[PDB]
Design an enzyme around this catalytic site. Structure first.
Site, PDB file in Angstrom:
ATOM      1  N   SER A 108       2.361  27.913  11.794  1.00 35.40           N
ATOM      2  CA  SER A 108       1.296  28.869  11.478  1.00 35.40           C
ATOM      3  C   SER A 108       0.993  29.933  12.549  1.00 35.40           C
ATOM      4  CB  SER A 108       0.000  28.120  11.154  1.00 35.40           C
ATOM      5  OG  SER A 108      -0.045  27.738   9.791  1.00 35.40           O
ATOM      6  N   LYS A 123      -4.236  31.272  18.194  1.00 37.70           N
ATOM      7  CA  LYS A 123      -3.764  30.832  16.871  1.00 37.70           C
ATOM      8  C   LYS A 123      -2.868  29.603  17.040  1.00 37.70           C
ATOM      9  CE  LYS A 123      -3.420  30.858  12.402  1.00 37.70           C
ATOM     10  NZ  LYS A 123      -3.222  29.374  12.467  1.00 37.70           N
ATOM     11  N   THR A 124      -3.207  28.510  16.349  1.00 39.16           N
ATOM     12  CA  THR A 124      -2.437  27.259  16.399  1.00 39.16           C
ATOM     13  C   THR A 124      -1.366  27.163  15.309  1.00 39.16           C
ATOM     14  OG1 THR A 124      -4.016  26.065  14.963  1.00 39.16           O
ATOM     15  CG2 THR A 124      -4.426  25.961  17.326  1.00 39.16           C
ATOM     16  N   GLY A 125      -0.445  26.205  15.471  1.00 40.66           N
ATOM     17  CA  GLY A 125       0.462  25.800  14.398  1.00 40.66           C
ATOM     18  C   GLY A 125       0.890  24.336  14.503  1.00 40.66           C
TER      19      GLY A 125
END
Length: 270
Positions: free
Chosen positions: A50, A214-216
């Site tokens: 993501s 922003k993480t994923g």
């Protein structure tokens, strides 16, 4: 789990940290005033998961600059669009949402249905890849839709970046002149408002920083966090990207590994 937890907390450089979780770790710390970088496996490919959603949003904002009121356009949310992970869009099934609100939802909650609806607006993964190329990025690539993009095979370059490429792209797009001023400030604010990374890079960074990130992740072994660091007392920002694959530890321990990247980076900046 105690010995692994202890080995992770005692690590004081990125190579030692990789060893403590028996993983593959990719990190770039970038000083935007000088361009100096320090890290680990800076030029190897990792699956974006993501983290790509930051640049999907940027693609939309860039298209809005030449199509007035695109951000005010309304897009239907249908039952057939819904996926397992859809925290915001689930409330709006059977009606519609503005393009702008879909952008916010996909950044700060990682809404998968929001992301697929935005892909349809801009022209799919080739549209995002084309924005990336136009921005100066010769490495990152968007290839598939949600959720298939999360299925990585060793040696398959679909939907990947490098720590160094993504760090540079964050500088040009969030801090530079790829977007107009009102567009990039809007992107910055969304990243600052993120709600999914409290236990990741933020957990290891001190109060002298204002963070956007922003993480994923995926279900097998990937967990990522990318961030921009603004000094609250003033001065040039830093950029910190972290990509991790580590299947021998738990999902939670992967976050702890990310938090430790934050602690090491903060000490390196000094």
């Amino acid at each position: 789990n105690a010995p692994t937890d202890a080995a992770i907390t005692a690590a004081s450089d990125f190579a030692a940290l990789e060893k403590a979780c028996a993983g593959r770790l990719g990190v770039t710390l970038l000083d935007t005033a000088s361009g100096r970088r320090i890290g680990h496996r800076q030029d190897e490919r990792f699956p974006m998961c993501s983290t790509f959603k930051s640049m999907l949003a940027a693609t939309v904002l860039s298209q809005a600059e030449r199509m007035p009121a695109l951000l005010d356009r309304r897009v239907p949310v249908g039952e057939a669009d819904l996926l397992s992970h859809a925290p915001v869009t689930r409330r709006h099934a059977g009606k519609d949402m503005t393009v702008r609100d879909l952008c916010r939802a996909t950044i700060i909650t990682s809404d998968n249905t929001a992301a697929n609806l935005l892909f349809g607006v801009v022209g799919g993964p080739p549209a995002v890849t084309a924005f990336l190329r136009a921005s100066g990025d010769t490495v990152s690539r968007s290839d598939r839709l949600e959720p298939e993009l999360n299925s990585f095979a060793k040696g398959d370059p679909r939907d990947t970046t490098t720590p160094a490429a993504m760090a540079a792209t964050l500088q040009r797009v969030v801090l530079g002149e790829v977007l107009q001023p009102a567009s990039r400030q809007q992107l910055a604010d969304w990243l600052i408002d993120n709600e999914t990374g409290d236990a990741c890079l933020r957990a290891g960074l001190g109060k002298r920083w204002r963070v956007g990130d922003k993480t994923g992740s995926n279900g097998e072994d990937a967990r990522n966090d990318i961030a921009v660091l603004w000094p609250v007392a003033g001065g040039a920002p830093w950029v910190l990207t972290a990509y991790l694959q580590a299947g021998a530890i738990s999902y939670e321990q992967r976050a702890s590994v990310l938090a430790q990247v934050g602690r090491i980076a903060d000490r390196l900046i000094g």
